[PDB]
Structures are given as C-alpha cells and as structure tokens.
Design a protein around this nucleic acid. Structure first.
Ligand SMILES: Nc1nc2c(ncn2[C@@H]2O[C@H](COP(=O)(O)OP(=O)(O)OP(=O)(O)O)[C@@H](O)[C@H]2O)c(=O)[nH]1
Ligand SMILES: [Mg+2]
Ligand SMILES: [Mg+2]
Lengths: 273, 233, 135, 388, 51, 102, 62
RNA sequence: UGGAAGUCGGAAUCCGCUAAGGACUGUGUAACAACUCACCUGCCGAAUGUACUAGCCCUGAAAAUGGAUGGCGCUCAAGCGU
RNA sequence: ACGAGAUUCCCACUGUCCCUAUCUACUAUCUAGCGAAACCACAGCCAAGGGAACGGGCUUGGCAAAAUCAGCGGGGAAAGA
RNA sequence: GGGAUGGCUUGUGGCGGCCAAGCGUUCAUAGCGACGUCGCUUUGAUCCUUCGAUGUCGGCUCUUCCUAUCAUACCGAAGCAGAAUUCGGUAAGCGUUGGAUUGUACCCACUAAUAGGGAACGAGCUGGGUUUAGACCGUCGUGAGACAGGUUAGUUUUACCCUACUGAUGAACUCGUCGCAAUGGUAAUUCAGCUUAGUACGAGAGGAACCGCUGAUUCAGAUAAUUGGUUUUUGCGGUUGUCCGACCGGGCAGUGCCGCGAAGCUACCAUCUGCUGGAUAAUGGCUGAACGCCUCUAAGUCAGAAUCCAUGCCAG
C-alpha cells in the first residue's frame, strides 16, 4: 500500500489535532454533505466523550450546494438527533448559514462569559471546508484555501471577535481496518497525481454517479465500461500520447479531480426512517 | 511421530552406551566447573552469576535450617481486639528538598530572529491541571503545562488498612516549595493533594459519604512516572 | 527453494531493476516492470540485474486488471543486450521479454509467443515444454 | 560516528606499494621445495610474450555444463627459443638466510649473455670473462675443480645460470636475459654433476614443462603512468561539477589521527608491477621445426601459430612456443618467467587432458576471417594485379 | 561409474556404442576442417562417381 | 525493549491454534486434553501483558520527551524496564502451561 | 561456507595430493627428468681435491 | 485415581524386630518388580568434620588510532608485611 | 488571458544513475626570456602523562640519514573571519 | 570592548505493609537489614482515546577501530524424530543491500544476513534546525514595530608554504650482473546445483548429513584472442552553404555534418587467475593427585573455530 493513502494519519498531524482540541472550548466538526457519515470522526467523538466532556461539539454540514435540499435537510435531521448541527455553504462572496453559526458561537460565548475569550477549533477530513468556513465567518480570506488536500499543515489562530477565536487544523484521517484506498480517494484524502494506476477507481465513480450526469457533463454516451469511457473521452478531448495512443491515465485523473471538486454532481442518499 | 515417541524409543532401544558414565563424570566435574566459573567469568555475566549463586546459597542454608529444626510480639500484654494497632498532627513527610525555579521551569524561546524571546516557562515536573481545563491561547499562556505530564489519578495507600487504591485527584492543596507551584498544581514529593475517597467506604458518624480527603505524595513522580500517596488518616 | 536457478554459467545481465519488458505468454499481461532479481547479491549503489533464464519479481503495468495488484514471479526468456555463450557465440534478441510463473517454475499461461532462450529453456522445464522456438 | 552503509575496501593492501618494479625481468621469489628422492630437474624457464589467439576445445570435464561439448577459449602465446646454461651457483644455509657461496661459469660465453654485463657494448673492448676463461686452461682447471667440490661439500641449494637466445626472437634487443634456475631432486653432488653436464648446452622448453600442466607466470604488468584514484583504485566518481574535481576522493580524512593514513587511496603510479599469477594450464608446446604446429588432429590445414600479417607489434613466432590458457601479466615483447607450481595441485582441472580441434590464425590487425593466404585468395578470386 | 570414481569423476565413453563396418574405426578423430572448407559439406556417398 | 517483548508475545499468540477457527473434532479434542477456558485465559493474559507493555513504553517515551537530565532519564528508563519485568514476572504459571501445551 | 584455511578442507586437499594428483605429477616429473638427462648425457692442493682458501666484522678488532 | 504398592497428588507420619532401617532420598514400572540413599554391622588404622576470623591471590563490567607501575624488565622478586 | 513567480504529476527524452570508458583543444608538465603577492615569534614525525579536560617545545618512550620533483588536501596555516 | 559533568556510563520501577539469615543489644530490649513476598499501577480483546521542536539531525565519497555477534566457522542444552529451529558459549577472519514515502521515521523486496556503535556531535560538499537586507498573510501593539506562527527569493571566493600521505629521482663506497631476506603489508568470501538419496528418520506429510563433482555472489590482481564502446588514422566514402569560371583537385563553417573505420585504450558491457603448515579459544577427552570415593588439571597430555603466527603473495 502506498504512503499517499497513509497521508492524514501522521503523528505530527495528530499532535496538531490534540493541540487544537486542548486549546479549544467549542469543536466544530465539519462534514461533507455528499458523505456525512463517511466524513465523521467517531474516533475524535469518543475521545471528547471520554476524556474532555466539558468541550462542546457542534456539527457543521458544509457543501450543501452540491446535494439536493431535501437530502440535506434529512441529513441535518439525522445529525441533530445526535449533536447540535448547522448547515453551511462556505463562500466569502455568497455564504449560507453564516448568521446561524455566528449566533451559535455568541451563545457559547454567553455560556463562557466568565473566561476572557473562547476558542473554537475546526476539525474534520481534508477538503471538507474548514478554512473556507473560517474565511466565510471572518469575511476576509485569512486562511489559505485550495481544492487539493493538505494545504493547512499547522494550527492558526484567527480572531473573529475580541472574545471569540477561531483555530484551523490540518485534515485528519482516523485509522480504520475497513477503510479502502478507493474509499479514501473518493472521500478526498489523497492527491490524484501521486496515486498509481488511477483508472481502477473510475468504476467506483461510475457507480456513485448516475449515467445521465456523466453524459451531460462530458457530452459523450454509449460506453460499455470505464475503459471505453476513458478512451472515448481521451479521443474527444485530444488527450493522445505519442503514436496516437489515448491518455487513459490523464483522463482518469481529470475525471477524479472533477468528482472531488464537484463538477460532477453526486450525493449519498439519506437512510429511510 | 505421535505421542510419547522418544520415550517409546528409549523403551525399545535404550540410550547411548556411555550415557550414564558421562552424566556421572559431568556431575563429578560440576564442582570444578563452578569454581572455574566463579574465578574466570568476567563482567556482567560474572555479576549475574555471583548474585544467582548468592541466592542459591541463601536458599540452601534455609533448607538446612528447616531440616535441622523439623522437630522442635509486643512488650506489654494486650487483648486480641487491641492487637495490630498503633497530640502532634504532623504529616508523614514534614520536610522535603526545595525546588529552584530553573528546576521547576525551563525557558521556551519564541520568535524568528537569531535572538529569541524567552518569556514562556514550561513546567518540568508533573502537574494536576484541574477539572474542566482548557488551555489558554498561545499569545497569553506563560506557564506551559504539557499534556504528557498531566496526572488525574494517584496510587493512594491507607496507612491502617494497608491497602492501595488508585484514586482520582480533586485539587492540589499545598506544594511546600512555593505557593505558585500550588497554584499551578505541581505534583512533587511531600505535596498535599485532595483525593476522592468514595471507593474506601469512609463514612461520618451519621451516614454521609465522605468523598474528599487529603493525602500526601511520597514519591518523585518526575523520576518514577507515577504518583504515589499516603492517606492522612 | 528461493527460486535461484542452479548450474547457470555467467552471462551478461541486460535487464536491471526498473526495466519494462514484454510479456511473452497469454496470461493476460503485456508488460512486466522488474522490481527485484532473485539471487542478487549485496553491493553499495549497484542495481540488481537479470539475464536470460533469470527469475525476477515483476509487476504488471499493462494487461488484465486482475494481474495489476499482485507481484508476480517471472522468468526472463529474451533480452536485447548481447551476451556470449560457452561456444563463443555472441547473440541478442530484438526485444526484452519474459513469462509469468509460480515460484516453483510452472507457468501461469499456457503458450509462449516467439522464441525463448536456450538458458531459460534448459533451466526451467515448463518453458521448454511450452516453447515453440528455442534459440 | 559510524559508517551508515557497510562497504568493503577499494583495492587490496597485499599489493602495496603501487610503485614501479625494481627491474624489468620478473623475480622468482620462491622455488618449489626440494625432495632429494626425486630425480634432478629444472623448475623455471623464460620466454617472450608474442600475443593471444583463439582456440576451440573439446571439453572432457565430468559434472560440468559444457561436458562433451565445444568451448571457445582465449590463450596466450609465448615464444620460447632454447636456453643456454652458462653457470652454476651454490647456496648455503646460515642463521641469516640463504647465502651464495660460489659461482662457476662456463668456459665459452656468448655475446648475448656478455651484453648483459655492459651498458655500452659498442664502445667496450669486450673483455668480460677473458681472464676467467684461462682458468680452465691453467693447472687443468684446478680452480674450477675447487669451486665445484666446494659446492658439492658445503651447499644445499644448487642453481644453474641460464640465458635466453634473443637473436631467435623478432626483438630488436641484442642483450639476453639471465636467471638462476633451481635444480630440484637428487643429492647436491647429483645437482653439481647435472649442471656440469649441462654447461654450454641448449635447453628446450619441452624438457622443462609438459602439456596439460599448470604453471605460474611471473612478469611485470603494463605500465599506465601517473593515474588518479578513480582508475587506480576503482573509487566512485563524485557528482557533476564537484568543486576542485570529481574524479577524486571527497574525504581523505575526517577522523583522528591528524594525518593521512597509508590505507587511503591516492593518485600515483599505476601498472608496471611485479606479478606472479598461478595455475595456468599449458595447452600446447609447439615445435619450431614443425611446419604445422598450429594444426590439430581435427583441423588438417597445414599452418603455423603465426597469424596472417604476424602478431601485432611482435612479428613471427619461428621457435618453440607455449600456449597458455587465459591471460598472463605483461605485454607483447616482454620477458616471461614460467615456473613450476609450488604445491601439488588440488583440482581436477590440473588433471584434465586438453584436446584442441582448431586454432585461430586469422589476422589480429583487423576483422580477419581467413586463416591462411590461400583461403583468402580462394575466396576473393582473381584480382587486377594478378593479370597485371 | 561408482566403480570408477563416482558422479562427476567418471568420464563416459560416447563412442563405445557406435555401430560401424570396421570396429577399429571407433576411436578415430574425424576431420572437420581442411584448407578453410567443411569436410561434412563435401561428404557424399557418390563422391567417386562425381569425381 | 518493548519491540522485543511485542515480537515475542506476537510470536506466542499467532502460532498457537485458535479454537474458534478449528474443525469441531480438533476443537473438542483440544477441549478434552486441555481446559479450553484455561487455554483462552492463558493466551488472553499473554495478549494483555503485551498491550500493557506497549502502553507503559508509550507513557515513558512521552515522559522521556520532557526529562531534563541524565539522572532523570536513567530513572525513567529503569522505571519502564522494571514495570515490564513485573508484568512478565506476573506470568509465571501461564508460560509453563503454554510450553507444556506446545 | 568452509574457509580456505579450514582444517577439514586442508585434510581433504592433503588426501587428494597424496592419492590422486601425486602419481600424475610423479610420472610427468619422471618423463621430464629423463628428457633432460638425455641432453645432459648427450696432490690434492694442486689437483683441487683438497678444498683450500679462495684466491665490519664478527669480532672486535684487537 | 482407569491404574498409584515409600517415590503423579492431599493429609497424617505410628508401632514392632531391632545392630539399623524414612509410612522413604532418587532411578525405574501402566501398576508391580528391581536398583539406590538415609541408617547399621564386618575389614582397615589415627586423626578428622563443620562454621567463622585474618593475610595474599582470581572475579566483582569493558568500548572504540598503538602505549604505558616513567621505560626496560622483575617470580626463595627488582611484589607485599615487619 | 498574461507570467525568467512557487508546487505536484504524465508522455517523450536522455551517462542523472547502474558504471564507468574514450577523444579533441587550452592548461597543468619541461625549456628560453620575464616574474610577483598573501603569509611569516622560532619552527615543523608521533604515542602516553603534563589537576586550571590546552599542547609543537617539558617528562617517558617509539624512533631517527643529505639534497630533491609531481600531486595532494589529514594537520598547521588560510574567510577585507 | 569581552566571550564562545568526565576512571561519568550499561539488565532488571516506585510507594506502602509482612517475613527473615544476620548486624546491634542484657541495668535501656530499641533500632538497621541481604534473600523473598503481597497490594496499586482481554476467555487471545479493541482497531470509535496517535496527548506540545527552546535545545536537531540527515545525506555523498572514503578509511580505520571496538564487541555489546545479524550472517558465515566450531561447540553445549531443549520432544531437538527428520527438516526448520530456540536458548547459550568461543570468536570482529569475512560480509551486512536495492527502493518507496516530506500535507515532514516507518514500510516493501532481494539476500546468508540486511548487527550495533566510536574516531564530529562533552573551515570538504550538500538538504532541515536557521534566523542580514525585499515582500505577503495570521496574532499582538495607537504606533514605529514585535511575534504562536505560515510562505517566497536570497555573496566568502586558499594551496605555490611546512608536515603527513601517494608516487618519482638521487650524492658518497669503481662500474655492472646475479642473489639473500631483517622489517612493513598480506586475502579471500558466501550461496546454489549433481551424487550421496527420495536414503537415514517418519503414522503420514515430508525429509537430511560426511567423502566426491560443477558453477555462481561479493572482493582482489591482471589481460585485449573475441564482442561492444570510443575516432584528429581527419583513413575512405557520402552530403549542406559558399569560394577557386566548370570537371578534377581543394579551402572555410575553430572536428561543418553523417556512415563505416584499423590501431591504441577500455568494460563482471569482455576474458583469465586467486595457493598450506604449525599453535590455540569455547568445548570433548586420557592418565591421575588434591580429598582412601571422585575429578579433563594440580604434574603430564590428546583432539578441536572462518581464530593466532608464518609460508605462498607485494616492497626491499
Ligand atoms: N461547492 C462548494 N465548495 C466548497 C465549499 N466549501 C469549500 N469548498 C471547496 O472545498 C475546498 C476545500 O477548501 P478548504 O478551505 O481548504 O478546506 P479544508 O478541509 O480546510 O482543506 P485542507 O487545507 O486540506 O485542510 C475549497 O477549494 C473549496 O473550493 C462550499 O461550501 N461549497
Ligand atoms: Mg483544502
Ligand atoms: Mg485547510
């Protein structure tokens, strides 16, 4: 197994995580709306429930513009059965849920008014939108944001108010014996250029995404499998190597980057009650 | 092969023709071999051999004493209900070694220039940070109490019951070296701590459960990796 | 046995670690990237290398997806580097090619395309039985 | 701290110093030990390295891969004109070692061996051994008899003085090569009588060595001049644009003592070293009188060992020659010392019998594919100059 | 081979089971090269009539 | 020290047969020869000692990160090794039992 | 692997030298000695029978 | 206890004949058997055994260029005590 | 869109490397002529001891033979250090 | 202007209570205490508890040393049947690799094995700690600016001196030829296959070893018959532009470019070669006292490791 799939489990990253947890009063656990139970860190939830029960855990479901609204509301219901949750679209220009999140942090500040200030630390997987949420709450691009994972490598304080501080954290991946490299890559842990043999994960993308969405997005139809789909896309887009050979690897990398960056619409449906 | 096959081979064929004689000769040379090992082994092997032979000699002479005597208390008389029983309200360790402020705190240098700023002090001894503790923001924390040096329980022993229970710590009452060390909650030798004594079944004269009691640290946690305490009963 | 062919005379090793050679059999693979050579000694900075008849550890870079996740034992049957035999003959093939086998030497495939080397055919009896041309 | 990745030494400490040899002719450091119940025999000889060629050998090596098959092997040709014995040296045993006691020379010495005692033979009066030749005449060789009886009475090691017949070689050198060859076997009186009977007589290579025997070759290697560490010791080249040179050793020292050690590779002389290589099999002792001495019992072409156009930078071999399997230290035109093996051999290869089937006589001045001029003329046909 | 040295020492005689017209031709050295040509190329049973 | 202890404990655990994966004849034959409760308790105590050794080593390495002198480092190392030796000494009976089983 | 300077390897080599290569070297040496013998054969003071004197130091000069 | 006879285990460990012999010190058997030890007697022939104390000597922990009672060298000392 | 801005990857490509080899010119080399500078307490082989964990001079040993040439970077020396 | 702990250390925890050989102690009968022991620190689970860089390490080339031995050699013990081993002993002679990962030390494979350190860490080169001057973001400050920090780009540049080392000459003894060997160095290493033998051993599955034979890994020393490489052989031929009016024969494009190319040099990219006596350590013994048994040791003595010393080998 490649070390690129072992990325996100480093001792430095988890020392950063526990530093943010020890410094923070309110833990904003950021979830991806396309996979909320997939991006949920029950490892950190167990640690917070066992060792530091005084800290308040709040779910923030980001990227709700990539999922249908009814599915997003169902996910909010499922998560609000457990913890106080908010809906969020982390954009500097056009945010959603920013006022509700500000009001929730104001309530927690009213609870901890005896202390001089409170610290709110943001945790979650890579590329869920932690730094983007910080930027949306601040109103200014104060944290570096990029669609590739692992831009935030250290912890950073950003003052939202004179009594509220915001802490950014590097993206963490809890270790699990049931997690696969395909699941990690589809959740967005890894970078697509560094992984080997990219086209093995294309059938997983074709399973998670409806066929008509692929046909509308890439303006191609009639493929019988992922290999023929990548070959047709390569011949259409001109991704040809020396000797007229299609660049299936580069086309698969393009499709994977589109899938994690949300140019291809997909979501996980909520469980039925 | 299956089952006791070497024993069956010894039954059906025996052993080597010199086996008993060589065993007897080796047992006879054992004394010379032991003396040669005692006079010619060197280093850690020699030290371990000498300690092990000392243990064997002690066990052997105890065996001789027992076989020789196979065929054979307080000063003042007290009744059976007063046996095993024992003003100045002194603690078990009334005086310890004082700790200087370099031995307590080291200087954490911060900045980016060649000349750093050294206002941050890190506590080197173990501490009890208290209940519901959240670390101060980094721009305002002076006294760093690291996570790996935080202790929440202590091995507290009852002087009368002669049993040791692992009890939670409630607060640090007095660190004898400095009141600042008490305020920081530093666990050193001779420090009075408050422990939860709910597991010892201590009760008052009417039935109220006593769940807080003073104990004193009797070890060096920074050298031993554990907090050991004696109840002040 | 660690898969080191015994009785092989010294020949020029033309395929080091990192070489991609053709797959001469019908097992579904079409190329083999060499990651190790069986029987390679210890030397500072020296890459392990293999010749015709040498057993190597390879991975498949093009072929059936089932063979792409495992490390296969291979036997090199053709090399492009010229080498000398005991009769003074210097020879080479037009391409570097090998076949996928089990550690005991039996092939995964059922037929071999193109000729095989004399050294490979002599050292591995299944290659001789599954070869059509021996050179 | 310690070296992180273990690696052996570059080069051997057993061949230090890497300096030029003290003299051109190879020195026999050790002779085979003497068994007095053996017959008397000579243990060394000299020749001149002509070059190399190719053979095909019908191999009979049971248990080998090429058993009952044909193998192509490289061989080295040494021209061996007959050697003349002109002296007898006696050695005694002392607590300080072997000591030369007396030396008896022959009555008549050739100008070849006389040239060795002069640096300017052309300006000399050639007076060497002139007064010594008169002691064979005065008092019926009484002094010669006294020295021979002294060797018979007091000595334990007897060596003959033998010189090469260099006029029979294509070399432009007229100055011969002289060496002491130990007589092994017999008693001391037998050795003295053996030398006395061998004075002024030519000794051929076939009476000292015999086919399918492994011998030792003693010589001085090819000189290379002042050579840096990379080719002198096989050290790793430093990366491209390394400051102050990349064909160097980066650290000649990082540790105490405050010195450069004798074990550190340094630039200097490479080649021209005295080397004794052992276990070389004699494949054929060919005769100069034979006009088909490079013809086997399978190849019936009547041809000599000389290639077409001769050996490159040597000439033609017209005397008795030795064919040696493999390569030997030295260059062409160089004096070669062939010595008996010091111990009884422990390999079946020394007990093998060599059966040659073909010897390459093609030109080494190019890509020659004919073995004689007649074959080339038969292949080409008639040319313009033949009609002209 | 076990009476005469063992495996790897005994030298087998490959001309012992040859069937020839005359038995003493068994251990003859068959020529192959003569004046830069191949004898086995010129071997022909009708060579007398051809000459 | 903890790597040596963990390697030997894992060699003990991973080589002994696991009854939950055996054929019912083999499992019940091992139950007839051996009290299966005793077998599982012995191997579980081996695994528990292995994990306790790992936890003790992790805690003492974390303390050695903050130790400030060679004397304190030496005392911490001796403390960790003594706790490991105490854990191994508390396994006197299962080790003899498992060797007889082997 | 057994070393070149190993006692059992030395004993094996000695037995080989005594039993196998020895007769071959003896026969070759006898033939060569015969061939060289072929080429070789093909008052006391005034006669040299009494070996007289030829025509720092070990002791202190005194 | 399937079997357990002193010798797989648990608990007791007595009496008689005694010169003396354990409800047994080990080997051994499936269990027995058999051998052996503790103990006693016969032969012998005069001094021993145990535990400590004080001397000298060995071990009682050592790394990393080649080296140090100052060096040679010293053994009824050229070492140690007077 | 644009960029001598920072980063990752793919194809091609090759002495970057396996693992080095060879050739050319100009040096370096030698000669005729011409001809400085930096630096310099005195000098330059090591080992052990020289309480101020310093030794090239001291002590105790190893030892030790004129005059030189080409390289060399361990030590000394050498960084407008 | 002033500066830049050390005959330390190693394999076995702390606290508290019992027990006890002993040390002390008889006008006081207390107190220490070896060897031990007892309490605190999951039915082979869990994988839903990774807990703070102020202190900096890496890497290339190369040499040597230590043993605290991973492998190879020998030996002792273990249900060690065989095979594979495990524990321990003597031993540093000989080896101990190739890679991936910087969102920042562990994995994978080959192999006999991938042992641990020192000579730095009490002015060689090159990546981080790491930090002159430019610039941006984050925190703090009214501010200049500072930092909990994060990012980018960024000037030290000997050798000809002495010594050491590597090589090369050399006066004096007339010149030269052939030698001896004090001393210094020293070299080989590991694996596989055939036979033994599908044999010993084994219920079966499986499955050795000595003698003998043949190769290969790493290392070392040479060599160029052959095969590749190299081309100022400017050797021959082809070809672009220009010039000598054209052809021929040539110049220039610093070797115009291309093809082949002897010779020379070269490459595990080619080929050849690498050798034997004595004394030992751990152990296994013989005879035999100490000590009327006994004992490999005391006197005497046999064997035995890749160890030690020499020969072979290089210098002289
Ligand atoms: N459509 C959509 N995209 C979003 C939203 N929030 C974030 N993104 C995208 O997700 C990417 C992740 O942004 P980050 O701020 O770096 O999130 P992160 O989890 O902190 O990423 P790391 O730096 O790896 O830790 C960004 O590049 C955005 O383009 C959202 O609300 N809607
Ligand atoms: Mg991101
Ligand atoms: Mg981020």
């Amino acid at each position: 197994k490649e070390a690129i799939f072992n990325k996100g489990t480093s001792k430095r990253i988890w020392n950063e995580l526990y530093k943010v947890i020890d410094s923070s009063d309110v833990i904003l656990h950021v979830l991806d709306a396309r996979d909320p139970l997939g991006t949920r860190c029950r490892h950190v939830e167990k640690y917070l429930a066992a060792e530091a029960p005084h800290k308040h855990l709040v779910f923030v479901l980001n990227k709700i513009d990539l999922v249908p609204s009814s599915q997003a509301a169902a996910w909010i219901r499922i998560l609000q059965k457990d913890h106080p949750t908010c809906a969020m679209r982390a954009s500097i220009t056009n945010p959603f849920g920013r006022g509700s999140l500000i009001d929730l942090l104001r309530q927690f500040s009213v609870l901890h008014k005896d202390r001089k200030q409170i610290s709110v630390g943001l945790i979650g997987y890579p590329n869920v939108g932690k730094s983007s949420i910080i930027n949306a709450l601040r109103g200014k691009a104060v944290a570096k944001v990029a669609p590739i994972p692992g831009e935030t490598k250290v912890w950073q304080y950003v003052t939202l108010m004179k009594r509220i501080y915001l802490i950014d954290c590097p993206g963490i991946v809890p270790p699990n014996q049931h997690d696969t490299p395909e699941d990690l890559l589809l959740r967005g842990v890894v970078r697509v250029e560094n992984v080997e043999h990219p086209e093995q994960y294309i059938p997983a993308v074709l399973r998670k995404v409806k066929q008509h969405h692929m046909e509308r997005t890439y303006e191609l139809r009639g493929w019988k499998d992922h290999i023929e789909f990548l070959e047709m896309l390569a011949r259409k887009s001109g991704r040809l190597l020396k000797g007229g050979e299609p660049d299936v690897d580069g086309v698969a990398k393009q499709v994977l980057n589109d899938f994690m960056r949300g140019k291809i619409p997909w979501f996980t449906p909520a469980p039925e009650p | 092969p299956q089952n006791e096959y070497i024993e069956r081979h010894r039954k059906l064929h025996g052993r080597r023709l010199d086996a008993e004689e060589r065993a007897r000769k080796k047992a006879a040379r054992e004394g010379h071999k032991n003396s040669e090992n005692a006079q010619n082994l060197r280093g850690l092997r020699a030290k371990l051999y000498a300690k092990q032979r000392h243990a064997q000699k002690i066990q052997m002479r105890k065996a001789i004493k027992q076989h020789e005597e196979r065929n054979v208390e307080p000063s003042d008389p007290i009744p059976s209900y007063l046996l095993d029983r024992a003003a100045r309200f002194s603690v078990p360790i009334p005086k310890v070694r004082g700790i200087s402020e370099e031995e307590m705190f080291k200087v954490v240098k911060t900045g980016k220039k060649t000349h750093k700023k050294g206002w941050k002090r890190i506590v080197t001894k173990p501490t009890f940070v208290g209940p519901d503790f959240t670390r101060r923001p980094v721009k305002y924390e002076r006294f760093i109490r690291p996570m790996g040096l935080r202790y929440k329980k202590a091995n507290v022993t009852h002087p009368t019951l002669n049993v040791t229970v692992q009890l939670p710590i409630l607060s640090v009452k007095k660190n004898p070296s400095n009141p600042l060390y008490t305020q920081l909650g530093v666990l050193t030798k001779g420090t009075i701590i408050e422990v939860n004594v709910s597991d010892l079944g201590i009760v008052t004269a009417s039935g109220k459960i006593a769940w807080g009691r003073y104990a004193q640290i009797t070890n060096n946690p920074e050298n031993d990796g554990c907090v050991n305490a004696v109840l002040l009963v | 046995k660690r898969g080191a062919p015994g009785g092989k005379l010294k020949m020029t090793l033309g395929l080091p670690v990192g070489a991609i050679m053709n797959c001469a059999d019908n097992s579904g693979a079409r190329n083999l990237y060499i990651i190790a050579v069986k029987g390679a000694g210890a030397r500072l900075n020296r890459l392990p290398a293999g010749g015709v008849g040498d057993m190597v550890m390879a991975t498949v870079k093009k072929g059936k997806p089932e063979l792409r996740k495992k490390v296969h034992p291979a036997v090199i049957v053709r090399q492009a580097k010229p080498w000398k035999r005991f009769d003074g003959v210097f020879l080479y093939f037009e391409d570097n090619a090998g076949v996928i086998v089990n550690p005991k030497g039996e092939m995964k495939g059922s037929a071999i395309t193109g000729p095989v080397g004399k050294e490979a055919a002599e050292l591995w009896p299944r290659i001789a039985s599954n070869a059509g041309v021996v050179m | 701290s310690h070296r992180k990745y273990e690696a052996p030494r570059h080069g051997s400490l057993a061949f230090l110093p890497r300096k030029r040899a003290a003299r051109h002719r190879g020195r026999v450091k050790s002779f085979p030990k003497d068994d007095p119940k053996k017959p008397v025999h000579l243990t060394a000889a000299m020749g001149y390295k002509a070059g190399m060629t190719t053979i095909v050998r019908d191999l009979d090596r049971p248990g080998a891969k090429a058993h009952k098959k044909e193998v192509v092997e490289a061989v080295t040709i040494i021209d061996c004109p007959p050697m003349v014995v002109v002296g007898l040296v006696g050695y005694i045993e002392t607590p300080r070692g072997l000591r030369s006691l007396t030396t008896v020379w022959a009555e008549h010495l050739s100008d070849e061996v006389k040239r060795r005692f002069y640096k300017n033979w052309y300006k000399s009066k050639k007076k060497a051994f002139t007064k010594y030749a008169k002691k064979y005449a005065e008092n019926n060789g009484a002094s010669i008899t006294r020295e021979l009886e002294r060797i018979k009475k007091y000595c334990t090691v007897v060596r003959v003085l033998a010189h090469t017949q260099i006029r029979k070689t294509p070399l432009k050198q007229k100055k011969a090569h002289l060496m002491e060859i130990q007589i092994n076997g017999g008693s001391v009186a037998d050795k003295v009588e053996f030398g006395r009977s061998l004075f002024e007589k030519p000794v051929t290579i076939d009476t000292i060595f015999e086919k399918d025997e492994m011998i030792d070759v003693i010589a001085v290697t090819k000189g290379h001049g002042f050579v840096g560490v990379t080719a002198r010791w096989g050290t790793k080249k430093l990366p491209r644009k390394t400051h102050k040179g990349l064909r160097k050793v980066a650290c000649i020292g990082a540790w105490h003592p405050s010195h450069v050690q004798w074990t550190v590779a340094r630039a200097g002389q490479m080649g021209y070293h005295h080397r004794t290589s052992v276990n070389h099999k004699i494949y054929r002792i060919g005769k100069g009188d034979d006009e088909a001495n490079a013809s086997t019992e399978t190849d019936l072409t009547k041809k000599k060992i000389t290639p077409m156009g001769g050996f490159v930078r040597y000439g033609e071999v017209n005397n008795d020659y030795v064919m040696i399997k493999g390569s030997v230290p030295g260059v062409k035109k160089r004096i070669m010392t062939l010595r008996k093996s010091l111990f009884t051999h422990t390999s079946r290869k020394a007990l093998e019998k060599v059966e040659l089937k073909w010897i390459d006589t093609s030109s080494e001045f190019g890509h020659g594919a004919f073995q004689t001029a007649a074959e080339k003329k038969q292949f080409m046909g008639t040319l313009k100059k033949d009609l002209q | 081979e076990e009476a005469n040295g063992g495996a790897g020492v005994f030298n087998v005689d490959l001309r012992k089971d040859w069937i020839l017209e005359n038995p003493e031709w068994k251990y003859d050295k068959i020529p192959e090269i003569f004046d830069g040509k191949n004898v086995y190329d010129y071997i022909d049973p009708d060579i007398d009539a051809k000459l | 020290t903890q790597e040596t202890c963990s390697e030997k404990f894992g060699a003990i655990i991973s080589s002994f047969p696991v009854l939950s994966d055996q054929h019912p004849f083999h499992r019940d034959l091992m139950n007839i020869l051996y009290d299966a409760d005793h077998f599982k308790v012995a191997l579980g105590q081996i695994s528990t000692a292995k994990n306790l050794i790992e936890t003790i080593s992790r805690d003492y390495v974390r303390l050695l990160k903050y130790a400030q002198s060679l004397y304190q480092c030496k005392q911490l190392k001796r403390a960790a090794l003594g706790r490991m030796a105490t854990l191994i000494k508390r396994l006197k009976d299962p080790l003899i039992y498992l060797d007889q089983v082997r | 692997a057994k070393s070149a300077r190993a006692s059992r390897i030395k004993e094996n080599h000695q037995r080989f030298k005594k039993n196998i290569a020895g007769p071959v070297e003896a026969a070759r040496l006898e033939r060569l000695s015969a061939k060289l013998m072929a080429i070789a054969q093909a008052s006391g003071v005034k006669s040299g029978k009494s070996i007289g004197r030829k025509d720092s130091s070990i002791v202190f000069p005194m």
